[PDB]
Amino acid sequence: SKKLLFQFDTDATPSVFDVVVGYDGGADHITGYGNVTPDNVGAYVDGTIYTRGGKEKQSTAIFVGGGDMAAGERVFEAVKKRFFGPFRVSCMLDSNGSNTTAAAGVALVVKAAGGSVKGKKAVVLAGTGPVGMRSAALLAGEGAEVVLCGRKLDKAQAAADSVNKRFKVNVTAAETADDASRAEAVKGAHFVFTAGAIGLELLPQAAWQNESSIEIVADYNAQPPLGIGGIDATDKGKEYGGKRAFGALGIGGLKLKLHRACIAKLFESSEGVFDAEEIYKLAKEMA
Amino acid sequence: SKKLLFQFDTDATPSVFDVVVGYDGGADHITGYGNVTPDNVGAYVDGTIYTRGGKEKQSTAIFVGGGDMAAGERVFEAVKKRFFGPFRVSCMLDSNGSNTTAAAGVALVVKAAGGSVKGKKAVVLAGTGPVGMRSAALLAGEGAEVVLCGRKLDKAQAAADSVNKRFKVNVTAAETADDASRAEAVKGAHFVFTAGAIGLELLPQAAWQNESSIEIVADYNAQPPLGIGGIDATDKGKEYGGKRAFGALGIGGLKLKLHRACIAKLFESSEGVFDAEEIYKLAKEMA
Amino acid sequence: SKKLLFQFDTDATPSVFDVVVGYDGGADHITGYGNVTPDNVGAYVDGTIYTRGGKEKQSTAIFVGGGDMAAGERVFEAVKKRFFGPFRVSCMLDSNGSNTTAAAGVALVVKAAGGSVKGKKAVVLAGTGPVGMRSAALLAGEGAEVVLCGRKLDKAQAAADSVNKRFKVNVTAAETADDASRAEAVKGAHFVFTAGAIGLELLPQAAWQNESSIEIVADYNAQPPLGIGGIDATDKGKEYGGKRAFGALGIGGLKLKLHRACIAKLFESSEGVFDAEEIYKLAKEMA
Known part of the structure; x- marks a missing residue:
């Protein structure tokens, strides 16, 4: 048929x-x-x-x-x-x-982390959009401690609640109203994802390459300026010091x-x- | 091409x-x-x-x-x-x-009747809808004497008028406003079709199984309660005493x-x- | 793929x-x-x-x-x-x-004219429409001196200007509001094209067959009465003196x-x- x-x-x-x-x-x-x-x-x-x-x-x-x-x-x-x-x-x-x-995005990161992200911390910047919310859900399903950030706490919490109810998980919301708050939010995190508007940088090079805890970064914005500074959109596990980056195009090919x-x-x-x-x-x- | x-x-x-x-x-x-x-x-x-x-x-x-x-x-x-x-x-x-x-539906009924329904009485309950009207038309084309029933006489008559003009036949209309009138309309009929709403009974078992004239019944409603009571939607000429029934799914397989x-x-x-x-x-x- | x-x-x-x-x-x-x-x-x-x-x-x-x-x-x-x-x-x-x-249409007429139409006068009757305009543009590109006629100089010049700006050519516009004026616009022309409304004649037989200069006529109206009187919708380079004609159907076959x-x-x-x-x-x- x-x-x-x-x-x-x-x-x-x-x-x-x-x-x-x-x-x-x-x-x-x-x-x-x-x-x-x-x-x-x-x-x-x-x-x-x-x-x-x-x-x-x-x-x-x-x-x-x-x-x-x-x-x-x-x-x-x-x-x-x-x-x-x-x-x-x-x-x-x-x-x-x-x-x-x-x-x-999440499968590539979990794979690069060794197969498990359980017990580790993941921060999703500008996570109130579709891809950020779904990334948060899948990461929480893998047992990562997830923080979903948004410009306003009401929108971030409404996104986290929606995710938690649909997926039976417990994502945490956080408000990051500006550049400084996003730089703060990723401190101590092991995995950072950026899911913001096209042509917008959310995390400058200096805001992640110096944070010892950060192991892997992933960015879903394919148009420069990229969501994550210091990488290339085609990066797919490329090494930056002891950290690995996944650019929007590398993720896009798997998608x-x-x-x-x-x-x-x-x-x-x-x-x-x-x-x-x-x-x-x-x-x-x-x- | x-x-x-x-x-x-x-x-x-x-x-x-x-x-x-x-x-x-x-x-x-x-x-x-x-x-x-x-x-x-x-x-x-x-x-x-x-x-x-x-x-x-x-x-x-x-x-x-x-x-x-x-x-x-x-x-x-x-x-x-x-x-x-x-x-x-x-x-x-x-x-x-x-x-x-x-x-x-009509082809299966005419076949089960032995190839001809010429000169016999056919009643189409709730026959003002598309399948009811075309059924009436085909039955009239086969020489059957047809009564097309509707809740209100003017609608039943408008339906018969449409059929009669398009097909050059003379289907008659009747008002059957309630269950009692539908049960009465089938008395003396040889063939009965129910072309009513989905999930609605129009002719309980008691209204057709004890009418000696009735030879075959056919129902276009496949959602229980079926238009004809006492039959299964899969029936395809199943015998109920000396009568035969065709359910909506039996007809639908051929459709x-x-x-x-x-x-x-x-x-x-x-x-x-x-x-x-x-x-x-x-x-x-x-x- | x-x-x-x-x-x-x-x-x-x-x-x-x-x-x-x-x-x-x-x-x-x-x-x-x-x-x-x-x-x-x-x-x-x-x-x-x-x-x-x-x-x-x-x-x-x-x-x-x-x-x-x-x-x-x-x-x-x-x-x-x-x-x-x-x-x-x-x-x-x-x-x-x-x-x-x-x-x-143009390719057929050019081939029939010997392969070159440069230096010659081509007239497009009722050419303010799409086919008329594009035919006028291709003829200009071939080097012909093209005149694009419309019922009102107003829209005729607009059509011409649109063509000249798009293809960098110099099409001229003329107003032909009468049967008489259309008959006049073709005197001295070597090629005439009719791209008028369906079922309307633009150039009667007596208006093209006695004009010495006319070599080929092409018509895009396939529904009688044809734009060009005296021919048949299916002519594909048919002879009518030393001249040749292309009807809309003949052209449409290649199209x-x-x-x-x-x-x-x-x-x-x-x-x-x-x-x-x-x-x-x-x-x-x-x-």
């Missing part, structure tokens, strides 16, 4: 980026919808679960995306709620790389291979649910 | 359901448009008749669908009106199974095979017109 | 005509977008340049279309503005045949093959730019 991927995007039109990776991941056909909401998605899902029977269902899958992570999560919950008994197909969530980027591989996994069963945890498990197999 | 199916849906976005079945029917590519009307479909049809020549024409086809059956009928008429001479492609009309479901086969037909010539008549003709060959 | 064509249409929905030709041109998959604008196309382009590395890039391409030619040009310029360094894919512009129909051929070229490298210049260069090779 032809592998059919139904792309439900919360934005006005479907992501061109997600279409290309979907074909490279092995979908035979991709049918996309924009403006998808928890309300209109149920009827779309009915179309995926009442048209094919038995083994054939694994040949149809769903991919929910768009730029707003919270909206994508609402649609993704409405999709899982529509399934009934054996009437379901595999589904995946990744809003603008919120899951695949974060999973690639692309990972996103592709996930789509392929959607068609190997009709019960897969690829959100943060499952995507991360695959990211560790591929890092 | 690749087999290209153009899906024109009268709803805001194209039916996911129709897309999967279309691909399982052999289309190599399906390109869908929502918000199609008699005014804008013309330009779309032009794109299908002026891009391929010779025998290559049969490799492009049109499928009109959506939830509003009358809206689809108006688009379908506008599509045919756009064709001229040999400048045409095969086309099919099916609004959420208006044609394919009704044809699968899926029929709908796929119709799509395949569209690419076999450039002059196919798959509306109630032709689809019902194929359903009888397949039942 | 599968050959992915991304269609950006400025109209509300993507052209069905362009989808069929794009698939017959060799695209493995076409993903179309309506309502594209200079502002929202940038993110669509990013999805084509950040998803495939190295030589896999030539397996993704872009096609800009829609009815409004100037709108298409703005989007096309925006697409090219988004590329940078090696981060690019081939792109094509053709707004309802604006480039492929005019390229087909189809040319448009398919351009699509195939988009997948041979990631640096192709198919606008009037390159399309015409291929049109001459194929005429």
Whole structure:
């Protein structure tokens, strides 16, 4: 049976980026919808679960995306709620790389740390965005003590609460209103991640290369000035003294291979649910 | 040339359901448009008749669908009106199974009745919806005396009027405002169809099993409580005493095979017109 | 890698005509977008340049279309503005045949004129439209002295100015509000083109067959009454004295093959730019 991927995007039109990776991941056909909401998605899902029977269902899958992570999560919950008994197909969530980027970043760092980050301290700068929140969740799942930083404590704590409730973890929030507070926040930390706006530096070279505790840094901003000063976007475990750096492009290469591989996994069963945890498990197999 | 199916849906976005079945029917590519009307479909049809020549024409086809059956009928008429001479492609009309479901159901009932229902009484309960009206039409075309029932007489009559004009038959209307009136309407009938809302019973076991005239019952509601009480949705001619029943899933199994086969037909010539008549003709060959 | 064509249409929905030709041109998959604008196309382009590395890039391409030619040009310029360094894919512009129909018509007329039309007078009746404007531009590029006629000097000069600024040529504009004036504008002309509204005659038989100077006439209206009286929609260099005529269908035959051929070229490298210049260069090779 032809592998059919139904792309439900919360934005006005479907992501061109997600279409290309979907074909490279092995979908035979991709049918996309924009403006998808928890309300209109149920009827779309009915179309995926009442048209094919038995083994054939694994040949149809769903991919929910768009730029707003919270909206994508609402649609993704409405999709899982529509399934009934054996009437379901595999589904995946990744809003603008919120899951695949974060999973690639954290898997690369955990691998470079020796396989475990349990009991160590990780600080996620500008962690209130999609990738920062998901990175915080996966790090907390690995047993790291995580601090999620934001410009205002209310937003940082609201992000940490959301993460804690969804993932059953205990991330801590912290307010870093300026450059100085971010330089402070990373003191004593073993792993530092920067998940801020494009073309914005959050951690100058001097703010990390002198901190003895810091073992590995990771940056998700691919456009100079980079989130982390002193590295190159293509760095992937490059050594700076006794520390290792992961630039946004090094992480991005794994994320692309990972996103592709996930789509392929959607068609190997009709019960897969690829959100943060499952995507991360695959990211560790591929890092 | 690749087999290209153009899906024109009268709803805001194209039916996911129709897309999967279309691909399982052999289309190599399906390109869908929502918000199609008699005014804008013309330009779309032009794109299908002026891009391929010779025998290559049969490799492009049109499928009109959506939830509003009358809206689809108006688009379908506008599509045919756009064709001229040999400048045409095969086309099919099916609004959420208006044609394919009704044809699968009536073909199975006529077959179980021994090939003819000529001169016998058929009653369609809650028959003002698409599948109810096309069922009434097909039954009337087979020579059956048909009573189309609705909660309000004017709606039932408007439904019968529509059927009678489109199909040149004389289906009669009746008001059945409650369970008591529905039970009465079936007295003396030979065939009974329930085409009511999902998850709603219209004819308890006691209202059909003790009526000697009733030979076969068919129900289009697959969600319990089923439209017909005392049967299972999977029933496909199962015997209840001297009567036979067809559940919504039993009919639906044939409907899926029929709908796929119709799509395949569209690419076999450039002059196919798959509306109630032709689809019902194929359903009888397949039942 | 599968050959992915991304269609950006400025109209509300993507052209069905362009989808069929794009698939017959060799695209493995076409993903179309309506309502594209200079502002929202940038993110669509990013999805084509950040998803495939190295030589896999030539397996993704872009096609800009829609009815409004100037709108298409703005989007096309925006697409090219988004590329940078090696981060690019081939792109094509053709707004309802604006480039492929005019390229087909001009190339046919030039070939029939002996291969050179420099120093000769060419008149385009009702050439304020896309095909008219592009035909006027290609003729100017060939060295002909071109006159672009419109019902009002007002829009005629605007069309001419648009052409001259875009292709660096010196097209002249003339107002022909009467049948009489159109008959007058062609006296002394060697080549005449009619690019008027569908089903409208611009140049009656008696207005071109008795004019000594006229060598070839070309008409883009395929629906009777034709723009040029006395010919047949299918003439492809047919003789009517020492003269020759190209009807819209004769020209359209080459336009189809040319448009398919351009699509195939988009997948041979990631640096192709198919606008009037390159399309015409291929049109001459194929005429």
